[PDB]
Amino acid sequence: HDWVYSGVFRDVYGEFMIQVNHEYLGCRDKSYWTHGYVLVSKEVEACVPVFLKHVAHDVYVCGKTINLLKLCCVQPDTDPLPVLMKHSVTAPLAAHVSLVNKAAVDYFFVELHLGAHFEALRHFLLMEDGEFAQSLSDLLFEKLGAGQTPGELLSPLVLNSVLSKALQYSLHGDTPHAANLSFALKFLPEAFAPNAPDVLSCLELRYKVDWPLNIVVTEGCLSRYSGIFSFLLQLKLMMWTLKDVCFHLKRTQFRQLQLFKHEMQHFVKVIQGYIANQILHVTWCEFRARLASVGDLEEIQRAHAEYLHKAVFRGLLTEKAAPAMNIIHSLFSLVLKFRSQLISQNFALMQQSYSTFKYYSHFLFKVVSKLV
Amino acid sequence: MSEFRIHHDVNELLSLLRVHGGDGAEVYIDLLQKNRTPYVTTTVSAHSAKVKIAEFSRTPEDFLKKYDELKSKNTRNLDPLVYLLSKLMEDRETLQYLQQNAKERAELAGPTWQQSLELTRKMLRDKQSKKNSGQRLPVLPAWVYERPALLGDFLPGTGGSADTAVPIGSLPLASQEAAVVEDLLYVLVGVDGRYISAQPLTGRQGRTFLVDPNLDLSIRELVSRILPVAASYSTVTRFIEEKSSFEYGQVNHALAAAMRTLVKEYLVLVTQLEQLQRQGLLSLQKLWFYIQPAMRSLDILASLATSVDKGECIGGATLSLLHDRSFSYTGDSQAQELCLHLTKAASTPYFEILEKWIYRGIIDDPYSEFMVEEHELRKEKIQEDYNDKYWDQRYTVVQRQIPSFLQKMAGKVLSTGKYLNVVRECVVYTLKERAYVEQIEKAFSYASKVLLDFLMLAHLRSIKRYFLMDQGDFFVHFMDLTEEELKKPVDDITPTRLEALLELALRMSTANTDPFKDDLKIDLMPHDLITQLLRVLAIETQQEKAMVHADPTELTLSGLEAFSFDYVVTWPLSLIINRKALTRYQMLFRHMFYCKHVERQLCSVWISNKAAKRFSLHSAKWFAGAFTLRQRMLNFVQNIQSYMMFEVMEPTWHVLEQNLRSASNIDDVLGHHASFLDNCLKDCMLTNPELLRVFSKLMSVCVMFTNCLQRFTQSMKLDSELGHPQLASSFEATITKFDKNFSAHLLDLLARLSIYSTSDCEHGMASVISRLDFNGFYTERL
Amino acid sequence: VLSAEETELFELAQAAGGAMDPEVFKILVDLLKLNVAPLAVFQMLKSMCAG
Amino acid sequence: NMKDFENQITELKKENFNLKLRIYFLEERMQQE
Amino acid sequence: MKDFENQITELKKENFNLKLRIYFLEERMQQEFH
């Protein structure tokens, strides 16, 4: 009862599996699930006498959750008379353990806004905000372009200050959970052979999550959200270059290049709508409509973990689909190389980009049939 | 113990072990301070630890006896101490290194229990007399000690009965039973029996009772079975009549009261049982059965009393003993009700004192039983002492005047009590701390809030006006008064006439609306600004040896750089300002005042060179070069001043004001002030001796250049204003040397600023680098 | 160096085994009084002695 | 990471200055007493 | 990170000697003025 209702288990000597050895409340770098649980061997092993194990784990987790929440809060003699059990006692204890757990997780949901953090990381760390990104990336490319940066965006001060200017303008943002976004590089932008046709864009956007929710929204989901942010960033670069080439034609071989551009853009658009159905729609639906509301502390973490797994599975980050996703990058790169010339107001380069696009789509179809 | 006691312990251990390498004291200190239990209350695998100590023991029995004695003295960190010792002796290398260090440091350099208790009473009265600083103690004349064994207790010297002694074997079984019941009940009331004899005791222990061997085997068996009850009651009545008199602490006397109440109820029961046995309606089995919870409570309270007596616990020591007595078992009860009632009554005086202390702030020591051991200290002297005496020595923290439950929140309790005491000068026991922990929590939050509202911005306004030289027209006026004293340090002259000059300058400037400048006083430091800065930035470093011979005669002479401002304020505002902060205030104010004096001298030289316009251009080329050099000097000084005021001091003042306006705790206010002072000193480049030395040299050479200028400047000004190769001879060759030295010092400052920005990565050096290189001619010279 | 309680804990220490400087034992008693984790203090005392 | 080391160096430069000032004022007190 | 590691090591060694001096001076004052 002490542990279920106050989140601490008392030992006076110590010879048992269940115990509290709580970390202090002055250290706020924990997740608060690090309290004592050091095991002890019992003095019985003949049939291994046990307490009711249905609640034996339950009390262990319930008391740790109670401690975390208190920061803010059979018969063989012939005589349930026959039959020995512990369920007449377990039920009144489990009722309070469950009440404490429910209250703790509900407090997490309604006060620390764990679902708001999840939607913030979807909006910012997975680049889900359009007409924000389709100006942010364009203005980045004005200071970059053609895949790799040309010696810019090497340190996180130019990109961060462009982001600071961009942050007033958004289609998903302007929230406390859309503020304190971390935009950073894990690789300085220097290729050992800069190329004009390239779509490779990798940068890591993260969203702050408070300490009591950073057991549900682990770093392991934010890293995959940033991986799909980078995938969508390469897509936004490709649509930026397509917009460039449409403007180049607009302000004016030309017709053949436009025909090949339209064919490739059709095919890329159908591929992108497949990706932005499977990896962008069903997992986003099952991550927005997935937050706990009965008040499970665990269920939010499991929901985020399954959201990440499903996003990666439909994102084609799985080894079966990895060649298909890699071919998508080459199709993007070929359509960018085609579009960079277009009407100038090289035919050979445009024919090469068309051939590369057809090779890419052939290879995508071959990988998809091979995995099927 | 120490404010940096982790560092001090690491250094002392490294010195004893002759270890100064390896990971370093830094890693060990950091891991100690970053890996910590909240408080030492968790139990360990204590019996595994006991076995480990036993296996490394030459004799486990004496080790266990010492453990038991320390538990009788409610020592702190004992099971964890055993665990740590076991873990240490697990490793042979750590063990052997520790023994080697200890050997290196070694070679490099009859009273009875009643008499013991009377001597303890005398010594405890003397102790409370001194700890109370002279406050009254409860003293009464008592003849109870003159004949304790005669008043139903047990003392060394007790026995059976020399007047009631018949052969129990010759007596019939019923007669033997009656006699044995009577002797048992007398033992259970503390007096001897007729066939059960209370034996003498050496040292305060359980009173033993010898059974006459004439009793029947079953009869003597059951007599011995009761004898536990007889010994319990004898020890109970001895403790009862010992603490019955008021010499020991309040908790001791309350415990004696509760114990004698329970003894009187036990003796009512004993007399009823005696009568029932007298009529033959009792058996030894029924005697043992009737009072089983009673005898459990008697054994528990006898153990508690014996632990109190052996460890002479009193005050919060005795309270910790009782709390541990009722907490070692915990949960589920057969006789712990009595112990819980006794603990509540024992802590009733202590609980009332704590309630008065932490709800109103009133505190006093009847025998220094409480958490607080009174030590009267001056509130004003806190402003004159580097260490703040109010928190440290006014009310102290111990491990034997503090109850075990209260020690968990002793810091919050003490803080709330001090807040409430400052406010005025301007409770029941539970098996769990929580029940009162939340009490002292809320009482803390109120204690701080109310203390804040009792203590209040004006003082910080006056500090900014004087120390920070806001409205510096007074400092410009004082420049001219300080200029008349340039030979010897100002500390050679009393500050009374300096304050008189300051106050006579005051009334000529608009300063009426500031009723806080009367708290400012003038202190004569034994060292000048440059020398003191150099010694501060050279102490705990190899620079002290080199600059111990340093003097300000070779550098700029100090005749006004020892003048400083201090802010002496009355209690409880004397707690906010301390000498540790006052030294930093004085150093900063002297540095600002000397920089302002140099800048005003440079500006006066520039403005007095206005008479050079009375002469043609082509006759002042040497004067033109000197003017360009001094203009560069003045521009550098002005840029440094503008940076270090309007980029450092105003933002740090705003941050300090925001922290004060948001927080309410006086301790947090003091911490914010200390952090502000540290930031100010670091932005002043006072954390880098190389940069502080470079700054001092630069400003000294600027002062020297302006002092060399002023003479001939005034001479030529007088000549021009009286007339309405000479100019070259007026221009000395030392000007080129001054210019070269200024250039060298500026380049050194810029280089060191860039080096520190790249390595130390302090936020202030990049700004000085940017201000030094802002012309397109030194950014590639950085 | 050692106080009354430090001397008592020192005698208990020698009863449990191991020879150790009075200043080092004062340091250890201060660290234990500072509410440091027994595992942490063990690790860092091992670091000090074995270093 | 590198931020922890930078913070430690920044903190200990000021801590060294504070210890130096504490030593200096202790020596001044022993001079005056 | 090596440069900051050595800078903080030097600062901590300086504070180690500063605190040893502080302890020595506290012992001197308690042996003299008490």
Return the half-sphere exposure (C-beta side, CA atoms, 13 A cut-off) of residue B628. Answer: 9
Beta-carbon separation of B328 and A25 below 8 A: no
What crossing angle do the helices spanning E2-32 and B25-34 adopt, rounded to 10°? 80
Residue B402 DSSP one-character state: S
Residues ending a continuous segment of chain C before a break (C–N > 2.5 Å):
none
**Distance in Å, alpha carbon of E7 to nearest chain B alpha carbon:** 6
Q: Which residues contact A353 (CB under 8 A, 6 or more apart)?
A: A197, A260, A264, A334, A335, A337, A338, A339
CB B189 within 8 A of CB B196: no
**CA D10 to centroid of chain Cα atoms:** 11
Nearest of A284, A366, A279 to residue A316 by alpha carbon: A279
B649 with B460: CB under 8 angstroms?
Answer: no
E20 vs D: CB within 8 A: no
Minimum-distance CB partner of E15 among B7, B12, B758: B7
Element (H, E) at B571: none
Interfacial residues of A (vs B; Cβ cutoff 8 Å) = 6, 10-15, 20-27, 36, 40
Half-sphere exposure of B371 (CA within 13 A, CB side): 29
For B271-278, which contacts have Cβ atoms below 8 Å and span 24 or more sequence positions?
Answer: B271/B185, B273/B181, B273/B185, B274/B181, B274/B182, B274/B185, B277/B177, B277/B178, B277/B181, B277/B182, B278/B178, B278/B181, B278/B182
Count other C-beta atoms under 10 Å from residue E29's C-beta. Answer: 14
The CA distance from B193 to A348, in Å, is 124
Question: Residue B317 and residue B307: Cα distance in Å, rounded?
Answer: 11
Instruction: Please give the structure tokens belonging to residue A297.
Output: 């502390």
| Minimum-distance CB partner of A25 among B38, B47, B329 | B38
For residue E25, what is the enclosing H or E element? helix E2-32
Q: Can you say whether the dihedral through the CA atoms of B520, B526, B531, B533 is positive or negative?
A: negative
Provide the chain B residues 585-644 that lie in CB contact (below 8 A) with chain C.
none
Residue among D17, D25, D29 whose CB faces B687 most closely: D17
Q: Which of B610, B622, B598 is nearest to B705 (CA)?
A: B598
Q: Are A225 and A318 in contact (CB under 8 A)?
A: no
Q: Report d(CA B471, CA B509) in Å as an integer.
A: 10
Q: Dihedrals φ, ψ of B198, to 5°?
A: -70, 125
Q: Which of B11, B61, B63, B88 to mutate to test the interface with C (most CBs of C within 10 A)?
A: B88
Give the gap in angstroms from C-alpha E6 to the nearest C-alpha of chain D: 9
Q: Which amino acid is at A328?
A: I
Q: What residues pair up with B197 in beta bridges, in sequence order?
A: B210
CA distance B262 to B267: 9
For tokens 């029932």, name the residue: B276
Q: Which of E3, E9, E19 sits opposite B7 (nearest CB)?
A: E19
Indicate yes or no: CB of A11 within 8 angstroms of CB of B43.
Answer: yes
Per-residue HEC secondary structure of B248-292 comes to: CCHHHHHHHHHHHHHHHHHHHHHHHHHHHHHCCCCCHHHHHHHCH
- How far, in Å, CA of B396 to CA of B400, rounded? 12
State both tokens at B100: 């080697």
Asked if B541 lies within 8 A of E14 by C-beta distance, the reply is yes
C partners (3+ CB pairs within 8 A) are B
Tokens 């006759």, located at residue: B619
Look up residue A312 and give its two tokens: 């990666």
Query: SS3 for B747?
Result: helix
Residue with the two structure tokens 């090469």: A352
Cα-based angle B386, B392, B396 (whole degrees, multiple of 5): 160
Q: Residue A99: CB partners within 8 Å, gap ≥ 6?
A: none
Distance between E17 CA and the closest CA of chain D, angstroms: 9
What SS3 state is found at B635?
helix
Rounded to 5°, the CA angle C10-C13-C19 comes to 85
Location of structure tokens 């209702």: A5
CB–CB of C46/C26 below 8 Å?
Answer: no
Are residues B728 and B586 in contact, defined by beta-carbon separation less than 8 angstroms?
A: no
CB of D11 less than 8 A from some CB of B? no
User: Among all residues of chain B, which has the CA nearest to that of C26?
Assistant: B9
- Alpha carbon distance B140, B125 (integer Å): 12
Residue of E nearest to D9 (CA): E8
Structure tokens at B119: 């001597």
CB of B605 closer than 8 Å to CB of B630: yes
Question: Within 10 A of B95 (CB to CB), how many other CB atoms are there?
Answer: 20
* A288 torsion bin: left (phi>0), alpha (psi -120 to 50), beta (else): alpha
DSSP helix/strand/coil, B197: strand
The residue written with tokens 């962008």 in the block is A280
Q: Taking CA A27 as the corner, what is the angle to CA A23 and CA A28, rounded to the nearest 5 degrees?
A: 110
Segment (H or E) for B522:
strand B520-522
Answer whether B764's CB lies under 8 Å from B682's CB: yes
Residue B451's nearest CA partner among B415, B412, B420 is: B420
- Give the three-class secondary structure for C32: helix
Q: What resolution in Å is listed for this PDB structure?
A: 4.3
DSSP sequence for B208-258:
PEEEPTTS-HHHHHHHHHHHHHHHHHHHHHHHHHHHTSTTS-HHHHHHHHH
Pairwise CB contact (< 8 Å): E4 & D9: yes
Residues with Cβ within 8 Å of B36's Cβ and at least 6 positions away in sequence, in order, are A24, A27, C34, C35, C36, C37, C40
Q: Tell me the nearest-neighbour CA distance from B317 into chain C, angstroms.
A: 14
| Token pair in block for residue B603 | 């500006």
Do B and A touch, 3+ Cβ pairs within 8 Å? The answer is yes
Chains E and D touch (3+ CB pairs under 8 A): yes
DSSP A138-153: HHHHHTS-SSS-SS-S
Tell me the C-alpha distance between B166 and B178, whole Å: 12
Task: Please provide the DSSP assignment of A18-79 as one string.
Answer: ----PPPSS--SS-S----------S--SS-----HHHHHHHHHHHHHHHHHTTT----S--
Q: Answer yes or no: are the C-beta atoms of B576 and B673 closer than 8 Å.
A: yes
Q: State the Cα–Cα distance between residues A87 and A274, nearest whole angstrom.
A: 52
**B347 close to B101: Cβ distance less than 8 angstroms:** no
Number of C-beta neighbours around residue A149 at 10 A:
22
List the one residue out of A258, A226, A218, A224 whose CA is nearest residue A242: A258
User: Which residues share a beta bridge with A204?
Assistant: A184
Tokens of B472: 């510096």
The DSSP annotation for A231-284 comes to HHHHHHHHHHHHHHHHHHHHT--HHHHHHHHHHHHHHHHHHHHHHHHIIIIIHH
**How many CB atoms neighbour CB B312 within 10 A?**
20
The rounded radius of gyration (Å) of the Cα atoms in chain B is 39
Breaks (C-N over 2.5 A) in chain E follow: none
Instruction: Give the amino acid at B466.
Output: Y
- Whether A15 sits inside 8 A of B36 (CB atoms) is no
The answer to whether B194 touches B160, Cβ cutoff 8 Å, is yes
Long-range contacts of A218-222, Cβ-Cβ distance < 8 Å, separation of 24 or more: A218/A301, A218/A304, A218/A305, A220/A305, A220/A308, A221/A121, A221/A304, A221/A305, A221/A307, A221/A308, A222/A121, A222/A125
Question: How many helices and strands, by DSSP H and E, does chain A display?
Answer: 12, 2
Q: How distant, in Å, are the alpha carbons of A207, A226, A352, B320 from that of A183?
A: 9, 10, 36, 55
B79 contact residues in C (CB cutoff 8 A): none
Q: How far is CA B146 from the centre of its chain?
A: 45
Mutate to test the interface with A, among B44, B82, B430 (most CBs of A within 10 A): B44
Does the distance separating the beta carbons of B47 and A15 come in below 8 Å?
A: yes
- Of D13, D15, D23, nearest to B760 by CB-CB distance is D13
Give the nearest chain B residue to C42 (CA atoms): B84
Among B4, B15, B19, B20, the residue to mutate for chain E (most E Cβ within 10 A): B4
B416 and B443 Cβ atoms separated by less than 8 Å: yes
Nearest to A11 by CA among B173, B176, C34, B45: B45
3-state secondary structure of A189: coil
Examine chains E and C and say if they touch (3+ CB pairs below 8 A). no
Residue of chain B with shortest Cα separation from E12: B26
Q: Which residues in chain B have their CB less than 8 angstroms from residue E33's CB?
A: none
How is residue B204 annotated by DSSP?
A: S
- Sequence length of chain B is 782
Q: CB under 8 Å to D6, separation ≥6 — which residues?
A: B761, E4
Peptide bond just before B349 cis, omega within 30 deg: no
Q: Angle CA(B179)–CA(B180)–CA(B186) in degrees, nearest 5? A: 95
C-alpha–C-alpha distance, residues B494 and C4, integer Å: 49
Name every residue whose Cβ is closer than 8 Å to that of residue B25 and which is 6 or more positions away in sequence: B7, B10, B11, B14, E12, E13, E16
Identify which of B94, B304, B274, B102 has the alpha carbon closest to the alpha carbon of residue B194.
B274
- Are B305 and B235 a contacting pair, CB within 8 Å? yes
Q: Both tokens of residue B443?
A: 């009482």
B568: tokens are 């002496």
Report strand pairing: B209-211 vs B196-198.
antiparallel
**How many angstroms separate the CA atoms of B458 and E3, rounded?**
44
Please give the C-alpha separations between residue B540 and each of B21, B634, B649, D18, D21, in angstroms, as whole numbers: 18, 34, 28, 10, 10
**Chain-chain contact of E3 with B4 (C-beta, under 8 angstroms):** no
Distance CA C21, CA B99 (A): 8
Pairwise CA distance, residues B484 & A156, whole Å: 56
Asked if residues B117 and B346 have their Cβ atoms less than 8 Å apart, the reply is no
Residues of B near A (CB-CB distance < 8 A)?
A: 36-39, 42-47, 327-331, 434
- Residue C15 host element (H or E): helix C4-16
Say whether residue E31 is in contact with chain D using an 8 A CB cutoff.
no
Q: Interior CA angle at B520 toward B517 and B521, to 5°?
A: 145
Taking the CA atoms of B189, B192, B196 and B198 in sequence, report the sign of the dihedral they define: positive
Residue of C nearest to B73 (CA): C5
Question: In 3D, which of D22, A126, B361, B235 has the Cα closest to residue E18?
Answer: D22
AA identity, residue B658: Q
How was this entry determined? cryo-EM
Residues 6+ apart with CB under 8 A from A47: none
Whether B141 and chain C come into contact, CB under 8 Å, resolves to no
Cα–Cα nearest to B19, from B108, B109, B104: B104
Those residues whose C-beta lies under 8 Å from the C-beta of residue A153, and which sit 6 or more positions away, are: A140, A143, A144, A159, A185, A189, A203
Distance between alpha carbon C13 and the CA centroid of its chain, in Å?
Answer: 8
- Please provide the DSSP assignment of D1-33 as one string: -HHHHHHHHHHHHHHHHHHHHHHHHHHHHHHH-
Min Cα–Cα distance to chain B from E14, Å: 6
